[PDB]
Each structure stands twice: as structure tokens, then as C-alpha cells.
Amino acid sequence: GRRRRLVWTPSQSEALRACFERNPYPGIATRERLAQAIGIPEPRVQIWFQNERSRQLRQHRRESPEGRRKRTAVTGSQTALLLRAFEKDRFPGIAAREELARETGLPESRIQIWFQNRRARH
DNA sequence: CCACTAACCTATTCACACC
DNA sequence: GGTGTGAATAGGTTAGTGG
Q: According to its UniProt record, where is this protein located?
């Protein structure tokens, strides 16, 4: 099961596109400011910038550095909890990831990244 | 029915602390 | 240099949106 898909308002689409036009590689501060200005969680903004670059690069392919998020600290206790879940299921859905976010205290978007990285390496 | 695309995915690299 | 791992990139796949 995946998270419920958002639908942009015209005002949100305009703000996303205008910020993309200024810089298609925003850092965490730009993404957080834009997220709050338009009322959308920052991970959804980051996912949109990724999809929009893919749309623009593909269309350019047949027509033709801002600061990163600070490294999330993961305690040994949080890691062991994620590892136990990973051993049972490597592809948790949104509800399983929200459970892990609740139990660990980490943002669900960091849980999602943790599982993507772990699958690539183990 | 079907085009578009948010959400999610893989593969690989960048960043950075640590020794 | 080497290791570990969180956050990024390019770009493919799945499934909901709406003509």
C-alpha cells in the first residue's frame, strides 16, 4: 500500500514551476521554505523536483550547489529496530513505515530513504 | 479507453565522519 | 586508502487522475 496521491492546486503548481525555473536543484532550505509557503510537506516537494527534472530532461533529450539536508543521526537502538523490520519485509508500505517512524521517532521520509539505501547495499 | 504523473523504485555517486 | 551509511543524482515502474 502506498501513500495517498496528492493533487496540486493551481497556486501550488505555479509556485513549484516558478521555483524550478530559478533552480532545478534546490537545497533543503529552499525546499522547506517552498513547502511551507504552499502548504505541502517537504518530502512531496522533493519528490516533485525529482519527477520534474525527469520530465524536463526527457523532453530536452528529444527536442534538442545549495546545501543538502543535514545527515540524520540514527542511534544504535533505532538501527536495530529498523534492521529487525528489514529482515521481515524489505518493502514496507506507508502504514508500516509510519509505524516505524512512530516507534523510532525519525521522520517517515528518513525511514523511506533508510530502506532504499539498505536494499541497495544488503 | 488512454495520456499524464505522484509515488515509488533501481543504480550509482556525493558527502562526510571516522580510523 | 578503506569503511559505513545518509542524501543526492539520472531515470525506470506502478498505480491514481482526469480528459
A: Nucleus
CA atoms within 13 A on the CB side of A40: 21
Resolution in A: 1.9
Answer yes or no: do A55 and A86 share one domain.
no
For residue A57, the enclosing domain spans: 3-70
CB-contacted nucleotides of strand C (7 Å): 5-12, 15-18
The coordinates were experimentally obtained by X-ray
* Cβ proximity of A90 and A112 under 8 Å: no
Interatomic CA–C1' length for residue A50 and nucleotide B8, angstroms: 12
CA-to-CA distance for A45 and A89, rounded, in angstroms? 27
Asked if A41 and A31 touch (Cβ cutoff 8 Å), the reply is no
Residues A7 and A48 in one domain: yes
